[PDB]
Amino acid sequence: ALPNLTRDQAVERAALITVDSYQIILDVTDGNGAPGERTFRSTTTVVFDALPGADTVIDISAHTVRRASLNDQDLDVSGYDEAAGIPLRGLAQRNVVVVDADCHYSNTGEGLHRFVDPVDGETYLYSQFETADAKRMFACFDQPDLKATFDVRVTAPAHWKVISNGAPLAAANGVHTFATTPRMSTYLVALIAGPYAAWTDTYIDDHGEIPLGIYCRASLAEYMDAERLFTQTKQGFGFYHKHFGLPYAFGKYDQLFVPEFNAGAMENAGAVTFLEDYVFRSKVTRASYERRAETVLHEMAHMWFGDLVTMTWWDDLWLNESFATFASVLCQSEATEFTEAWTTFATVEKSWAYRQDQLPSTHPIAADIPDLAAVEVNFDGITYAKGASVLKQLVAYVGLERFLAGLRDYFRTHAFGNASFDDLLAALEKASGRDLSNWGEQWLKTTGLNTLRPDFEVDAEGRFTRFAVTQSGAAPGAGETRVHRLAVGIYDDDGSKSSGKLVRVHREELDVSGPITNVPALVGVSRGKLILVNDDDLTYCSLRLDERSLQTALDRIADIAEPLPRTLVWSAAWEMTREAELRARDFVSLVSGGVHAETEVGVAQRLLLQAQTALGCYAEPGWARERGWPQFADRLLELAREAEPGSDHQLAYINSLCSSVLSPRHVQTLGALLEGEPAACGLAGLAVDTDLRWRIVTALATAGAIDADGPETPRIDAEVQRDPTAAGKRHAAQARAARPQFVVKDEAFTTVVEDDTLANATGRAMIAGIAAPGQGELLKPFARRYFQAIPGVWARRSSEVAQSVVIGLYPHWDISEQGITAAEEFLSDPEVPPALRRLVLEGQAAVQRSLRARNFDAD
């Protein structure tokens, strides 16, 4: 097991050593010019200064350590254990350590991952090291405040491309060398190698030229849209260079779509890796292009927030992720075609922030992270989305100019170095010309949400006689009220002699503080028909509406002209549903009747997923099975049939039908789309392409309509013959596990929780099939099996890989007091490690929320 580095251990090591350079020499061949299969050779030379006479440890996870030396004295490696690294005893002032090892390839997305493409037999490698998996590829002091230069050399099969952080030098006789990097952290070192297809372009401005590359597997090249990605890339560099002062510091900029990736992307300096789902093989909506552009711009923002300046320790991961999230959405809004990015943020990412902040594991943005175990579960909706939301509010509070000026100072001060909370706040304080210590304490060091509401009286002509914004204390948390810069918007009719649309007819900006903030400027103003006290989504809060405004919202959501205020209403309704203030069936009604007016297909997609959570988790289950699901499925098919042919909305409604709980009529309709012209089904212009076929096959498998005679799967196997790709095989694995047969669920469950050799990406696909909609009664036995299995999975697999089972197989379907008690009994053992307890507490809290919602929906 790799070492669980503690905050205290990291501080202790950084007080003793300062690293200059690494030289990393890799051989990823089999020693005969072909790709290696199990291990690769890694020979690392590190130069570092030390307090003379101290001891340290160099980290390394290897199959074999062949030799290790300190200042050319050979070390005894006969007792080598990856948990202990290699001890370095009696350090000199100036040191050279060499470690020559055979390291293991990964098939679980941590370390140097190896994949074989079934289409062409080609091998592809990529690295992934955040947080502390660099030690699986090279010996190092694996912590982010021990920066160093990197000089990488790789021996590879002759036909391969080889990409690292640095620009390539000409390769010779299998050997690829790279330009030495600037000083950076070990978790950012990259290796991507194999017969990847390439595209090239260049970004040019007054600062100079950045060579751009895009890479993907050869078998996916026909699907690449490199011009669109290069356009977005260049828009990003133009925006960041306009605002951040220091230009991009890491040379060239390669973007590599890699197989079996665990996350969405990773900001390795000069060598950003991506989930290869972003190479679209089939038709996707604008939602997918917009999310991919956000990801491109997020990784690029990290070239400043994480790569140029890095947090000292993982408690300040928000310095990377809150800022990268905020900056990427700002850049998307202002520099790209995705001009509604703040609308998408308010519906998609803020909903994630609220869910995370309300769990019993809620933690401040500036977190307390005692060890690696704690950070490996902290890449979450607070570190990302709440932090970005709170930074958006800081920009409202001090203004964008002072905010950006403070960041430009921060970058210049800490360039190629490390920063903590106190360093960031010092820079923003200097630039803002005011004390932000109280602001930081109440916003960055707290948990929870403040509820914001209008409180007013009106005269007989509907004009305010008094208006305030009321603010609840933070919950869950320490109950404080905060300072907010926010806007009050009043919405009313735009029509000539007509209702027409609800448009903004009055706006007031104000400084809100404490429980009640009077708004004198609204005395004598018409109350209109809908009041929003977080207009333009400037602050992080729980928004609620006065009675009349809420009735207007529930009746006229489709009349709100502008996407952002319409999203503020969708979000308030969804949050009221989560909070047992709006019945599940009323939220489903609202979406079913209003989504035709939601022009932003990304927002519409999220509303349909919410409606599906409402039906599957929040609604009285008898009503959901007998009425709610079949009505929602019928509405999706009506919506699809009324949509424009070939449109994004047409596809979204059919995608949602494929993930719903189906009646026999819906099963017939979807099966007909596999065999026939879609026009015959009233769906002219719908492309029943490779991935929509798989979504339909998975729906038919889930419904018991195909391969229902026994565990054999001739129909799904025929679909793999049609699409015999790594993607088709993972979709097939999902579809086979989705079938409502106990023996199929049991075989899949046992495979994924037992077989440590199974690729994590395949496991995940099987888990998505196990936990299929509508199957909660069938899956009840797997609740106890889950609680009995997860300690072993957590002990055998890394946190990130174990999470596939711990998060993905939590029994969210067992919505009962017995299900709550099952988690309580697991949690009653005080020796369960804190990160595993956290994930079970979160699962238990989601089921508790579902029970409270079902009681509200029934009554």
Task: Say whether residue 307 binds Zn ion (CB under 5 A).
Answer: no
Q: Max CA-CA distance within the chain?
A: 92
Residue number with CB closer to Zn ion (324 or 390)? 324
Active site residue 299: yes
CB of 74 to Mg ion, least distance (A): 34
Task: Say whether residue 321 binds Zn ion (CB under 5 A).
Answer: yes
Among 324, 614, 720, 770, binds Zn ion (CB under 5 A): 324
The string of DSSP letters for 76-90 reads --TT-BTTTBEEE-S
Of 1, 100, 94, 97, whose CA–CA distance to 43 is shortest? 100
Residue number with CB closer to Mg ion (669 or 804)? 804
Secondary structure class of 698 (helix, strand, coil): helix
How far is it, in rounded angstroms, from Cα 735 to Cα 715? 10
Residue number with CB closer to Mg ion (100 or 380)? 380
Residue number with CB closer to Mg ion (380 or 691)? 380
Q: Which of residues 128-187 bind Mg ion (CB under 5 A)?
A: 130
Residue number with CB closer to Zn ion (300 or 688)? 300
> Which range, of 123-131, 432-440, 456-464, 472-480, touches Mg ion by CB under 5 A?
123-131
Check: CB of residue 595 under 8 Å from CB of residue 608. Answer: yes
Total of residues contacting Mg ion (CB under 5 A): 3
Instruction: Please list, in sequence order, all residues whose beta carbon lies within 8 angstroms of the beta carbon of residue 806, skipping any fewer than 6 positions away.
Output: 790, 793, 794, 836, 839, 840
Q: Given the DSSP bridges, would you call strands 86-88 and 123-128 parallel, antiparallel or unpaired?
A: unpaired
Q: What amino acid is encoded at 30 in this protein? A: D
Of 347, 328, 352, whose CA–CA distance to 338 is shortest? 328
Among 276, 800, 814, 842, binds Mg ion (CB under 5 A): 800
Total of residues contacting Zn ion (CB under 5 A): 2
Q: Which does 321 bind (CB under 5 to 8 A by kind): Zn ion, Mg ion, none?
A: Zn ion
Residue number with CB closer to Zn ion (324 or 692)? 324
Q: Which does 823 bind (CB under 5 to 8 A by kind): Mg ion, Zn ion, none?
A: none
Q: Given the DSSP bridges, would you call strands 208-216 and 253-258 parallel, antiparallel or unpaired?
A: parallel
Q: Which does 575 bind (CB under 5 to 8 A by kind): Zn ion, Mg ion, none?
A: none
Q: Which does 800 bind (CB under 5 to 8 A by kind): Mg ion, Zn ion, none?
A: Mg ion
Phi, psi at residue 66, to the nearest 5°?
-70, -50
> Which range, of 63-71, 315-323, 587-595, 848-856, touches Zn ion by CB under 5 A?
315-323
Check: CB of residue 125 under 8 Å from CB of residue 91. Answer: no
How far is it, in rounded angstroms, from Cα 741 to Cα 746? 9
> Which range, of 314-322, 338-346, 365-373, 701-709, touches Zn ion by CB under 5 A?
314-322
CB of 553 to Zn ion, least distance (A): 34
> Which range, of 251-259, 321-329, 355-363, 704-712, touches Zn ion by CB under 5 A?
321-329
Task: Say whether residue 120 binds Mg ion (CB under 5 A).
Answer: yes
Q: Which of residues 519-538 bind Zn ion (CB under 5 A)?
A: none
How far is it, in rounded angstroms, from Cα 508 to Cα 464? 13
- In DSSP terms, 153 is beta-bridged to 25, 177
Neighbours of 242 (CB within 10 A): 13
> Which range, of 113-121, 473-481, 512-520, 753-761, touches Mg ion by CB under 5 A?
113-121
CB of 324 to Zn ion, least distance (A): 4
> Which range, of 74-82, 126-134, 152-160, 323-331, touches Zn ion by CB under 5 A?
323-331
Phi, psi at residue 519, to the nearest 5°?
-125, 80
Of 854, 769, 788, whose CA–CA distance to 815 is shortest? 854
How far is it, in rounded angstroms, from Cα 378 to Cα 7? 15
CB of 218 to Mg ion, least distance (A): 8
CB of 369 to Zn ion, least distance (A): 16
Q: Which does 120 bind (CB under 5 to 8 A by kind): Zn ion, Mg ion, none?
A: Mg ion
Instruction: Please list, in sequence order, all residues whose beta carbon lies within 8 angstroms of the beta carbon of residue 215, skipping any fewer than 6 positions away.
Output: 161, 163, 192, 196, 197, 198, 199, 254, 255, 256, 257
With vertex at residue 397, the alpha carbon angle to CA 387 and CA 568, rounded to the nearest 5 degrees, is 65
Residue number with CB closer to Mg ion (130 or 842)? 130
Residue number with CB closer to Mg ion (325 or 450)? 325
Which member of 122, 299, 349, 429 is catalytic? 299
Check: CB of residue 127 under 8 Å from CB of residue 271. Answer: no
Active-site residue numbers?
299
Interface positions with Zn ion (CB under 5 A): 321, 324
Interface positions with Mg ion (CB under 5 A): 120, 130, 800
